[PDB]
Amino acid sequence: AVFADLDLRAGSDLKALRGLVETAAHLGYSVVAINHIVDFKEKKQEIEKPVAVSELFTTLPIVQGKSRPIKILTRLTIIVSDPSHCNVLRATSSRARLYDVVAVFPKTEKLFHIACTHLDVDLVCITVTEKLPFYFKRPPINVAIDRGLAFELVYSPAIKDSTMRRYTISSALNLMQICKGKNVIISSAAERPLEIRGPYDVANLGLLFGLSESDAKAAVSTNCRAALLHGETRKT
Amino acid sequence: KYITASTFAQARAAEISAMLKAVTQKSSNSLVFQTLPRHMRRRAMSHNVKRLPRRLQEIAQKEAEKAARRCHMNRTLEFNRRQKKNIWLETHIWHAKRFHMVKKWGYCLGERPTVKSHRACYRAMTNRCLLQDLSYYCCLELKGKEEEILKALSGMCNIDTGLTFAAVHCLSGKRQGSLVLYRVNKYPREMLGPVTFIWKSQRTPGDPSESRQLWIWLHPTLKQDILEEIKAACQCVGENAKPIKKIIGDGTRDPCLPYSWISPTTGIIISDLTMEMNRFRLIGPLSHSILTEAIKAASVHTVGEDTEETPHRWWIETCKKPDSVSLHCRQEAIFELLGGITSPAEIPAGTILGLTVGDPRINLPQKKSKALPNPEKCQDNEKVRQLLLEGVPVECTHSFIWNQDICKSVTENKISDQDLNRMRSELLVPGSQLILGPHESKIPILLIQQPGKVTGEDRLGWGSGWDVLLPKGWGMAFWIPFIYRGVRVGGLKESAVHSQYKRSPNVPGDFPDCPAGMLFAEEQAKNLLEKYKRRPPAKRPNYVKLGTLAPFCCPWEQLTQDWESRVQAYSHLCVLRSRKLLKQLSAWCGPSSEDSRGGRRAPGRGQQGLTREACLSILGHFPRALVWVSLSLLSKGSPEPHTMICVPAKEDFLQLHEDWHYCGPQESKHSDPFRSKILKQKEKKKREKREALTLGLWSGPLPRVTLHCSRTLLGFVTQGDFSMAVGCGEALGFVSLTGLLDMLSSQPAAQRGLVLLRPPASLQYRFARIAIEV
Amino acid sequence: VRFKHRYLLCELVSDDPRCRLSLDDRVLSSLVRDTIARVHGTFGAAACSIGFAVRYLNAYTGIVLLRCRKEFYQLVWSALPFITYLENKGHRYPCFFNTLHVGGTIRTCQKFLIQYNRRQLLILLQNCTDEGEREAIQKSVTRSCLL
Amino acid sequence: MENFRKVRGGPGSGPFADLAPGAVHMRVKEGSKIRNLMAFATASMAQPATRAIVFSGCGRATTKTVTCAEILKRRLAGLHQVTRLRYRSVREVWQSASLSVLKNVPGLAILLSKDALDPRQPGYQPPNP
Amino acid sequence: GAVEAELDPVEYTLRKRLPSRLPRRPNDIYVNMKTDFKAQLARCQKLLDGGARGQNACSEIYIHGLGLAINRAINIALQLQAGSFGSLQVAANTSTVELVDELEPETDTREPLTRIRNNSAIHIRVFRVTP
RNA sequence: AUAGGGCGGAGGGAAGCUCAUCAGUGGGGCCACGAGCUGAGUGCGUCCUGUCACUCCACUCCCAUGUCCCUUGGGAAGGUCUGAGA
RNA sequence: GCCAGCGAAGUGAGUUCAAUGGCUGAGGUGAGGUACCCCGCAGGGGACCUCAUAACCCAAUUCAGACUACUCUCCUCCGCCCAUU
């Protein structure tokens, strides 16, 4: 019954990063991972010592729920637009074997097909902001659910913009008609020190996305548990 | 100072939220009448105010400003006429006033309380105190010479199988025994009945020449069976008075009953005493304290000095003997040592300790449910160890209520229970217990405890029950001092959870024998068939589609004939209650593990081995047998009565090894060709106007017992309920030997008692753990 | 002849504690009823206004108790993540956080507030490590035993 | 099966160090040592030493060091014993390759004394038979 | 006849009559064996945090146990210190529990030889010390 | 005669779906003992010497704080009277 | 006609600013259908698919009984009218 395992996209400074850890430790979170933005613009490879959370945090994550220490993981988010950049992921898989759970962000439906079948990742980043044309096809979804591949839905609609509220709820329901809810997680990015929600608050926010009446609670608990369970055998 | 100022707010957050929930429980919508505890609520508080306490009445007098015919008949003669039908015990006016009275095979007795106390009876049994009224257990006194009262009964108890009573020499003076009787020595394995047996002989003669007595404690379904067998085995020979005895017994007092005849050759005097004295089973850890504190021994030194005006001279002649005077002090000293004993779970096996008791309504505390813990003094360590190790009170065991003329004089005085209640209103004692004692009720009683779960090694002392034996005239007068100490009293349903959580079968009819169990199972079949025809269809689940003949527990006239037809083709209703063979059967089903050589431990201190040829020799030695099995569900199960035990397949063991918390497979439905004869019957019934076989009854039970269901069914469950002791579903029922040894031969490997069960209202197989604890 | 209610708890977890001093029942009723009209339309703005009322609020502590029906608890409990920008004289950014959705039954809703309060002061012992504040914790334990 | 055990009787053995007591140790599981340690525990009543006997035990030995100090109470009849309950880290390495794992077993230690605990016990509470 | 065939039931071990009084103002917990370990520490956590709900008030608990039980009764006490995280002083008291065994085969010529046996117990007492 | 279709009245100590997964919720239940308190065996010390060692030999593994079990709105709970829990 | 009570933990639901008859899927029974299978007496059974499963109403200490409000239903007793022989 490992509950409230979500991921954050957060690096600017150690003061803003530790504030999100202490806030997530306050609410319900027992597994908090930090994502890294890697794109085709700068083409940087910082894999070996990106943050070193265990060498900077003061050794005591304490929650007020189960009262257990937090397993802090390191995850990677690769923004892929061109198929020439997708071949970089197949080259760094044997050079540096870190970043236990790998998440990729596709943009083309031809590249989305090889991401669900041929590309060896763990989660799929699906964010549609400010008129991003990307339609969903049913055979690449039906292979990824049998493989065990998950799909992300990263939201932050409540603070920045009101126009961005509509693209997060409309692009979600285009996926709900096809995927049916076999492995769907809903994490949230946080740049400001207060851009996170409560542990039981996600259970209605998944029902706000629709998708279920009871299994939306399992989208933050059960489907998030399968990310570390499937990604552990990929590393070893 | 924000970290300091936040502490004052969070401290008051723990104060205000605690005071908002504590005052509101005492407020109850600002009402005085609902502030009372829920056990102490009466709905007649508005008609008469006298049903309220004194301190709560003063507020209700201020609330009164803001907010059928008479009966003049002799009620004693009314209840005398009503006693001609039933048996009508002395404590019937206590029980019928606050219990659901249901007429049964004998008389009407208390079964369920009017207040909901199902969780309260178990809670008053492992922690608090409890007591019952079990007076239907008859007794048979047998007076005769010592050489004749054993030769006529030696071929009835089967010495080499169960517990003996004849020459065991330890159950004689010290304690009682418990065993199962049978028929004559021709060895039929047909008729059987459990009897808690008592020996006592006089110590100072020490020879087989005096009068030797022994009692047969039995069940009223066996009262027609045992009394006609002992007769066949030994020798083929004004004022308003309270009818303390029976009217059925006194109406048959001249022709037949009580059966008190003598035998010419053997000298065996059969004394039938069905209702001669009453019995109360006192069960609990705190039941050992209220038996000690409320009951006080009779002062033999006060009366016997100079006061001699009135009879009870039978105790005066006892006080005249100086040996009985010093013996009564030893009987009280161990009885006062019982207050040092903390629980009746550690006292070896059914001890007997009788003494003389001055009646405990002399104290009669004013408060109700006045429960007290132990005193903080815990001295006399050497005196407690003397009784725990040896436990030989032969001098102190003096069952003085076994005399005929003395027990008559106990009842002959005919004391009034209401006139003594006026004595506290005449003397007007505010807080003292002052009763004048020139002549009191100095009559003895008997104290016998009973251990629970001796064969089962799970709890070892669950049911710790004392028995207070006493004559017929002292009924409710001895009942009422226990009520004001904190005792919650159950009934027959509480007498049913006494055995099913102790893993022993119930004594009326749940074990299948020939004269007794066939009459109660048919009576059990008449109650639920009336309930089955009471409910209209589309509300109950059908039984042809799901399972087999259920919840009617009589296919074992042909089920035990079928399991012998499966094996032998390639004396009836036998129960293997032989504890020498049950030690072997406990080794096969009980330990189900493998580390080096044996189950759950490598030394074992026993004999581990696989021999299938010796198992087939047991089946040819005892054909058509039936053995009870205690079984334990692992998770996600709830056993009902009359559920079927089914043999698992090879695919059931592979799925549970692959996945933990795996629910069992479902049941494929069966075809019902009997539906076409229903519209044939309904259209013929309406034709003849202008054999009742509707939805699960048919007289064709032969081919279904062979192979009907998907999984092969082998056993039933009689006591099906979820346990408050273990914490899960614990069923209790009966299987056959050939059903076990066919499953046990298939699995010499890992876990063996993992056997699925299927309730008849469902279609879901659920697995339990078979373990025979003998 | 009676209505089945639902009682949901909330907690303001934020820095700059002048926002916690600016709490009122008139502001909170004008905040929740407005943000339902911003997320949902005029349907949920009045379907969650016929039973909605405030009952329990401590500005120094930060626990919010709200009323809602059996048929309309899913609209209030889904509008809780979208509550930002509590506009006042200063610059404030609070955000509510649920603890446990209690189905009616005020008594055990206050019982969960006690066990949440007891777990907060025990963790606060070693993390703060102040001599003047530890004596104030001993004033909280002693007065709680007197209850 | 190679263990690595650290010692976390820490502050209390200060005044015990000035008396040089007789330490009694029970590692995990040894049956004949009960006949060996009680041979010296009976001898320590006869040999000239101070009233200070130090016991220890962890893992499964925490139920055997209680029985070891109980039999000596039937002979010496000590009136004060301090039973302290502290974490004890056991790092064993067993072969499946070599696998290392850290275990936190409970520990127990009984300090039989008679004279030195007269200014003591504000809240220590030794039993007095 | 203690070698070939004999029944050996163990009767009971006296604790005291105190668990009729001990669940009123304090709270007592008898740790058994072969039931569960995760359930027993959860029963220690709820009974320690029950204020005006459990029996009357949460003040202090302490734990009994016999010679097999004290291997795991010490395990629930030390994990409560890291669990409850507060200042909870642990004091233990050892004593002797008598144990009377009865063995009697189903034979006329035999008599039950009652053996003497003792077993070790502990009284791990958990305070509520103000930090 | 065909209780074939339609409708209505009276009566019963009539009855008012169950099961499986999952979730919510109020609770209840969740057993002081391994024939290890001079325990047994092995190799040394030693035949009187054991701050002797090893065997989860009785598996109880695990960052051990319940992924444990059962039950949770009726035949009339509704009124609204009579009677019982002294 | 008149006279008798106990503040003490914890109701196989036990709430008290007043919890709980949930969803999906598979059945039962009551209508309807078959290009499907088996048994061979034109017949019957099984398999599969569609649909009905309600109204009256709500525990507040509990139980027995009377009375009253009822229909997805089953049993008994009949009436009226239509049509048929």
PDB file of N, CA and C in Angstrom, chain A residues 113-135:
ATOM      1  N   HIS A 113       5.337   5.875 -32.587  1.00  0.00           N
ATOM      2  CA  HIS A 113       5.146   4.450 -32.842  1.00  0.00           C
ATOM      3  C   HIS A 113       6.372   3.645 -32.428  1.00  0.00           C
ATOM      4  N   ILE A 114       7.570   4.145 -32.745  1.00  0.00           N
ATOM      5  CA  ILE A 114       8.791   3.455 -32.345  1.00  0.00           C
ATOM      6  C   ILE A 114       9.108   3.678 -30.872  1.00  0.00           C
ATOM      7  N   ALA A 115       8.502   4.689 -30.245  1.00  0.00           N
ATOM      8  CA  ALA A 115       8.681   4.880 -28.810  1.00  0.00           C
ATOM      9  C   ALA A 115       7.903   3.841 -28.016  1.00  0.00           C
ATOM     10  N   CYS A 116       6.750   3.412 -28.535  1.00  0.00           N
ATOM     11  CA  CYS A 116       5.936   2.433 -27.824  1.00  0.00           C
ATOM     12  C   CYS A 116       6.376   1.005 -28.117  1.00  0.00           C
ATOM     13  N   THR A 117       7.143   0.795 -29.186  1.00  0.00           N
ATOM     14  CA  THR A 117       7.536  -0.542 -29.614  1.00  0.00           C
ATOM     15  C   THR A 117       9.035  -0.788 -29.522  1.00  0.00           C
ATOM     16  N   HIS A 118       9.848   0.063 -30.147  1.00  0.00           N
ATOM     17  CA  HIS A 118      11.276  -0.187 -30.297  1.00  0.00           C
ATOM     18  C   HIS A 118      12.130   0.538 -29.267  1.00  0.00           C
ATOM     19  N   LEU A 119      11.787   1.777 -28.926  1.00  0.00           N
ATOM     20  CA  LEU A 119      12.585   2.535 -27.972  1.00  0.00           C
ATOM     21  C   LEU A 119      12.361   2.019 -26.556  1.00  0.00           C
ATOM     22  N   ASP A 120      13.458   1.792 -25.840  1.00  0.00           N
ATOM     23  CA  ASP A 120      13.431   1.206 -24.502  1.00  0.00           C
ATOM     24  C   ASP A 120      13.373   2.334 -23.476  1.00  0.00           C
ATOM     25  N   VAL A 121      12.156   2.757 -23.132  1.00  0.00           N
ATOM     26  CA  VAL A 121      11.940   3.735 -22.071  1.00  0.00           C
ATOM     27  C   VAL A 121      10.965   3.147 -21.062  1.00  0.00           C
ATOM     28  N   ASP A 122      10.684   3.892 -19.993  1.00  0.00           N
ATOM     29  CA  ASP A 122       9.765   3.439 -18.958  1.00  0.00           C
ATOM     30  C   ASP A 122       8.456   4.208 -18.923  1.00  0.00           C
ATOM     31  N   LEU A 123       8.494   5.527 -19.099  1.00  0.00           N
ATOM     32  CA  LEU A 123       7.299   6.357 -19.120  1.00  0.00           C
ATOM     33  C   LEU A 123       7.326   7.238 -20.362  1.00  0.00           C
ATOM     34  N   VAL A 124       6.156   7.750 -20.740  1.00  0.00           N
ATOM     35  CA  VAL A 124       6.002   8.595 -21.921  1.00  0.00           C
ATOM     36  C   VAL A 124       5.417   9.930 -21.485  1.00  0.00           C
ATOM     37  N   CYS A 125       6.155  11.007 -21.741  1.00  0.00           N
ATOM     38  CA  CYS A 125       5.719  12.353 -21.384  1.00  0.00           C
ATOM     39  C   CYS A 125       4.691  12.827 -22.405  1.00  0.00           C
ATOM     40  N   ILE A 126       3.501  13.185 -21.936  1.00  0.00           N
ATOM     41  CA  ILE A 126       2.442  13.719 -22.792  1.00  0.00           C
ATOM     42  C   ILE A 126       2.017  15.048 -22.179  1.00  0.00           C
ATOM     43  N   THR A 127       2.551  16.145 -22.717  1.00  0.00           N
ATOM     44  CA  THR A 127       2.148  17.496 -22.349  1.00  0.00           C
ATOM     45  C   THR A 127       1.843  18.286 -23.613  1.00  0.00           C
ATOM     46  N   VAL A 128       0.638  18.849 -23.677  1.00  0.00           N
ATOM     47  CA  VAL A 128       0.194  19.654 -24.810  1.00  0.00           C
ATOM     48  C   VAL A 128      -0.081  21.060 -24.299  1.00  0.00           C
ATOM     49  N   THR A 129       0.798  22.001 -24.643  1.00  0.00           N
ATOM     50  CA  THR A 129       0.683  23.389 -24.215  1.00  0.00           C
ATOM     51  C   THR A 129       0.738  24.297 -25.434  1.00  0.00           C
ATOM     52  N   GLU A 130      -0.261  25.181 -25.548  1.00  0.00           N
ATOM     53  CA  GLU A 130      -0.329  26.258 -26.545  1.00  0.00           C
ATOM     54  C   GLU A 130      -0.300  25.723 -27.981  1.00  0.00           C
ATOM     55  N   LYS A 131      -1.353  24.966 -28.317  1.00  0.00           N
ATOM     56  CA  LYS A 131      -1.654  24.469 -29.666  1.00  0.00           C
ATOM     57  C   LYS A 131      -0.523  23.588 -30.211  1.00  0.00           C
ATOM     58  N   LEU A 132      -0.336  22.454 -29.536  1.00  0.00           N
ATOM     59  CA  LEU A 132       0.627  21.454 -29.972  1.00  0.00           C
ATOM     60  C   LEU A 132      -0.119  20.360 -30.721  1.00  0.00           C
ATOM     61  N   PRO A 133       0.004  20.269 -32.052  1.00  0.00           N
ATOM     62  CA  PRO A 133      -0.754  19.251 -32.794  1.00  0.00           C
ATOM     63  C   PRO A 133      -0.175  17.848 -32.658  1.00  0.00           C
ATOM     64  N   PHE A 134      -0.878  16.984 -31.925  1.00  0.00           N
ATOM     65  CA  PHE A 134      -0.448  15.597 -31.764  1.00  0.00           C
ATOM     66  C   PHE A 134      -1.686  14.749 -31.503  1.00  0.00           C
ATOM     67  N   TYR A 135      -2.053  13.919 -32.471  1.00  0.00           N
ATOM     68  CA  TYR A 135      -3.209  13.045 -32.340  1.00  0.00           C
ATOM     69  C   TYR A 135      -2.773  11.646 -31.919  1.00  0.00           C
TER      70      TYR A 135
END
